[PDB]
């Protein structure tokens, strides 16, 4: 009915501790979803071209053609850490608990209200009590998978401000070729956009593949709940690298007196100690020789790009980085970069139109420096000389820039890692596995990988609003009455956590408010308000 | 339903009187509040700074720094007499009972409206019927405790004329430093805001703490009836000091005649009679002597400010004053003042802006008279020589202005006295209690306080009414329709009274009108009204 | 039996999670006590005098003389934090829970062994399988009760580190003067420790109060399970000092520009506001004169000793102070100072006989700043001239060093304050309440107080072990084997706690450890050791 509501605004989250230490956070998001008329009631495919930009030279990187279906619908995506949970809860889940458990997630959409503009300089708004908000579920997954967290396009973090969604669009199969070059290239490499291969050419529209309903004021729809099934995520980090894995050296002698330069000692000379290594030539056993179980960590490709059907694109790695070698001064390749706006971080009250960045890089050692890797000859006779070891310093290929580090992959049957941590408040939470008969043992987007079939995906467009003329019959964009759109949105994601318990003699770390950041979590003499990135993985835990 | 009433205007009061006297007083309350929309959507924190003020040696009392959360939502409050009882009703309750308990409450918000402001120089009013005021109400009391009684900031007293919630706004924690100094203070005191502690820091948003209700014309909300629980208030007043309890001396001595100057007498010299005294050194047994059992009422320090982590403040005083030597010209440290608007007291016809005072002054004597305090040497020896004494007029620290007196506290295990009586019509009913291990023993702005948990506030707020034009992603301050909004209110608030009985011969005091008053209980040829203050404890009581 | 055990070492606590977040944490700890045969096996009554010290002038406080009864008992005692929590525990505890309940109470005592030594030169050891060591369980509570807790004689803070019981011994009644006097001070004061007042002499002795067990190495006892009967603990801290209790002035200019120097503004003359205040004289209503319900906290003398019967003794104070005008050099009277060895913090291997000392300082707002405070002259005319001011800078009495603030004390009916707060690894955990017809509201040296029965002493002594030759009938000394003892103990504290909600947007205080603790929490190359003193109530909390 016009006069009446038909939901609950609700941005509260509930944990609710059971037996044996298993809370059961259930956060709850309500928003003011705000919606305009599509630019056009059409499906376009595009094609965005920039070729003088990489026909720089030297410039490969910069690539960006591509095609794209533009579907004329909006796309209402709450993918993302910050739109369940406050920094006051995250600091919570974070400091108490150990493992996480994505469970169920159910939205709905209600109070829905459609508004109309008009002239002269003086614009006036008018209720059109008649008009219609369509919303479709793609439930099933018709469509294709777009989570909107990775463009910074995901709900507002803040429930005391209205929000958008985005306008929906997907990829579209298209050839591309481009050939790698410097600066100093000679010449011409062909860098040109192929086309389209027909047998990959796949237009998708909501009308045809999924059930649209139409809601008026007195509307409202509600999705079903739905139970995720999947590994639990962990809050805790690791950081035994191969070298402090197993039974350290028994030392001989312990030293006397406190001391910064009083080390213990071995006291036995480095080949005639017992032990095992796989070196089946020398008697060396160092704490660089000596047998470790398996592999922590492994060494892949450094910037480098490989290119298949559609172009150049970026190999990515899964283990980062960190370090008292980093401090994200160092940091490189694997430690991932978040730029975002105003809606979901950047100081609100921020003029000028920069992103905002941030670099996350967590507290796992399991990753490498390579500064310190290097090969010698199996002969092993040291000191190594020159001929007999490469090292990261030694160029390959003959570029004084490239070492031989910058194309080594380590990975095999001994290597062990960890999945992604959850990235407050910026990160993706579940992402869909991919399609393919074989696939990745992790996602290096999302904590949490649904099994089966990832929740579907809710779009919403409202309908169009015909005048007194038109005649379909006719090439001219149709004429519509200019009609924008409010509703109500709210989900509730609910996970089950557990609880953390104390092994160690010594405090760990925890997430805490200090005279530093302490301006971080309230807002400005204006209203000027702003969301800082926090790690999730404090506490630390033996790997082995 | 839009053209359907969901609720019934009633501010109707109703004693029912039971089996042994003990009425059942059932005050109701309407009011057509009225609403504008925030003056922005945010949360601001702000800083209030008045240096220059205090800046000026021996004005340290004048102190205003603080610091706020801004809250964009509105405060319905009905904490007030003012509000639940007319003046006829006071002069019921006031006259024939004794003690009155608070014993339930319970209100809602039907028929709610929401309009649209239009231009020219003409406005035009039109209503937009699918928006939706906000009501949440924080029953649990996660919200912080903000009486608006204090500032007189309460519902209108009237129920025939419109009425308005406050602004919400709450004290946020910061440090700040003040030393004293008079005028003749050389250089300058530190005066200065420090900032805030972050151990300290708490950020509340209704939106996060509480669930919001939208509701549209057809809409409507309503609390539960909540029970209070918590001591019964009484409508006596005593007045027997330490010096009137007890055996009076046994005269020897009655009077022959009548007459002002015929006073009949003890006939005993002041060292040979018989009875009990506390000063083992002499044997008089005078009146001031003779021990009473305890001692009603206690002396504190006058006008004197401490000062914590935040700034100098008054040191409350729970007994005031009164008496034939004071008449509200001799008022001093603990009578409270109330000073107020239109909507609660100030004759509504009166122009100008300057808010109507008034000093309340207790019936019951348990307050002192510092004059005639004194103190002597252990010795007693009396005439008292001036080395043995000292006076209320001898200084004290060297300042001529400053007596013992005035740093005299003489509170101890002894001490008994009684709590604040309720001041009709701008005095606050119920009071939470301070969440502290230690509580105090009463509250000097409230008759009653809830024990467990005090009802819980209710907060309103016109929901956003965005445009066609709309932009998170811009720092630009968001642009809304014009809309207020006007909704009834209703509570219920019922105590249960016990009757009275006459012990004495004599007839007691009552409330009443008189050829002086007269017009103070009606209303003016233009329609000016006025509510003039009443005392509530009108007839007296044995203490003892 | 002699080759068989008869208990468990076991120091492992044990967080239970319940229903409704309900922790019961179950503290078990162990140690090796050690002990030898007392000094002689007669009970002798003592004086301390040190009249020479305190005869100085001006040198009252270091006053030291008193009487007592030296038993020849030890007692195991340990009641302290530091017994019970290794630091790991003591940091879940503190940022996860918000209230703790003291609940029951066991220990026993096995595996005891009982040795004897011989000479030459060369010691030589051996077991005395048929001697007795003797227990003895004060339940009823006829023993004197001595917290050992409060001279740093508790047990020791280390599972790994075996421990040794206090020699006990109690108060004997003796009366004593000595006039106060400063340095400038002529003549002798008298300073004279009178005796001993029959009617208060009580001489106690175990032998006639209780039953003492005597064990051989196959004995072991056990004491019951006893349950603690008193109020919760609570781990959060409040700083809304009388300043910020209520509803702020309303604002009537929003600052328009972010600004450290952009203050918002009250906007209206500070005598025609509206509002309460207990200042009957003025019309000003300003933060310092508005009316808030109570007060926080109090003022009391500091460092002013008060003396009776036995002598001068300082006059605890129950707020202490804190501050950003405190930082522990302004720490005041209030603020405990605890003086540790090295069985209970000071670092082991730390040489030099000089105890460890920290002033703790709590996180609470409700302790004073008397620089602040002042007294103004009841009309109330500002700028306050020098004649009706009297602040903390004139002095008292004459003396330059003495301010009105110094004998201050503003404890009323109004007074609100809190319980101490728990001081890891230092600090009482339970003490027994005062045998008066009137307690105290608060001990100031434990959280938990047993309002019925405290736990029983326990109390241990090797038996005397006579040589072949011994007749009482000797006024000489009897003389014994040398003997000494060891047994195990084990105690098991029950606390239940209650989970902690978030309920601020903004994170909390948290305990954790960083770059500058990070070796407070680990051993030396040496094998040194050391606790460091957390504080418990992180977390803030609305007091009104
Ligand atoms: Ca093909
Ligand atoms: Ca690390
Ligand atoms: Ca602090
Ligand atoms: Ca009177
Ligand atoms: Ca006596
Ligand atoms: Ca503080």
Not at 496 to 501: N, Y
Request: net charge negative; charged share 15%; with cysteine.
């Amino acid at each position: 009915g016009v006069g009446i509501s038909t939901g609950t605004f609700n941005n509260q989250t509930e944990f609710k501790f059971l037996e044996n230490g298993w809370v059961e956070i259930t956060a709850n998001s309500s928003r003011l979803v705000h919606l305009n008329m599509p630019e056009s009631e059409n499906y376009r495919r595009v094609v965005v071209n920039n070729m003088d930009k990489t026909a720089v030279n030297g410039n490969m990187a910069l690539d960006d053609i591509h095609a794209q279906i533009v579907t004329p619908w909006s796309l209402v995506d709450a993918n993302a850490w910050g739109v369940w949970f406050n920094p006051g809860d995250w600091q919570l889940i974070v400091n108490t608990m150990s493992e996480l458990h994505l469970v169920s997630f159910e939205q709905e959409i209600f109070n829905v209200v459609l508004k109309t503009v008009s002239e002269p300089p003086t614009k006036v708004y008018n209720n059109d009590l008649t008009a219609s908000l369509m919303v479709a579920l793609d439930s099933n997954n018709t469509m294709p998978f777009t989570p909107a967290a990775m463009r910074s396009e995901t709900l507002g973090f803040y429930p005391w401000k209205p929000t958008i969604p985005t306008p929906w669009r997907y990829y579209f199969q298209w050839d591309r070729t481009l050939i790698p070059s410097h600066t100093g290239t000679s010449g011409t490499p062909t860098n040109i956009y192929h086309g389209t291969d027909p047998d990959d050419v796949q237009f998708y529209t909501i009308e045809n593949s999924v059930p649209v309903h139409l809601l008026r004021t007195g509307d409202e729809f509600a999705t079903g709940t739905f139970f995720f099934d999947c590994k639990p995520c962990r809050l805790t980090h690791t950081w035994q690298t191969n070298r402090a894995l197993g039974l350290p050296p028994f030392l001989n002698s312990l030293p006397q007196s406190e001391g910064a330069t009083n080390f213990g000692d071995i006291g036995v000379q480095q080949d005639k100690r017992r032990g095992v290594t796989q070196m089946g030539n020398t008697n060396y056993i160092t704490e660089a020789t000596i047998m470790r179980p398996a592999e922590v960590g492994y060494s892949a490709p450094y910037y480098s790009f490989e290119a298949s059907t559609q172009g150049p694109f970026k190999t990515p790695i899964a283990a980062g980085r960190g370090g008292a070698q980093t401090d994200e001064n160092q940091a490189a390749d694997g430690n991932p970069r978040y730029a975002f706006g105003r809606q979901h971080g950047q100081k609100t009250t921020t003029t000028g139109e920069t992103p905002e960045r941030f670099t996350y890089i967590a507290h796992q050692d399991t990753g490498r420096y390579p500064e310190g890797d290097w090969i010698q000859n199996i002969n092993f006779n040291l000191p190594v000389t020159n001929d007999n070891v490469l090292l990261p310093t030694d160029p390959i290929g003959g570029k004084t820039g490239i070492n031989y580090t910058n194309i080594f992959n380590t990975y095999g049957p001994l290597t062990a890692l960890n999945n992604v941590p959850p990235v407050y408040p910026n990160g993706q939470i579940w992402d869909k596995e991919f399609d393919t008969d074989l696939k990745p043992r992790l996602h290096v987007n999302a904590p949490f990988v649904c099994q089966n079939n990832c929740p579907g995906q809710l779009f919403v467009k409202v309908a169009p609003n015909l005048t007194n003329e038109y005649d379909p019959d006719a090439s001219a964009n149709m004429s519509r009455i200019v009609t924008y759109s409010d509703f109500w949105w709210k989900g509730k994601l609910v996970f089950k956590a557990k609880l953390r318990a104390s092994h160690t003699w010594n405090p760990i770390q925890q997430m805490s408010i200090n005279v530093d950041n302490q301006f971080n979590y309230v807002p400005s003499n204006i209203g000027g308000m702003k969301i800082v990135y926090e790690k999730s993985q404090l506490a630390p835990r033996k790997l082995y």
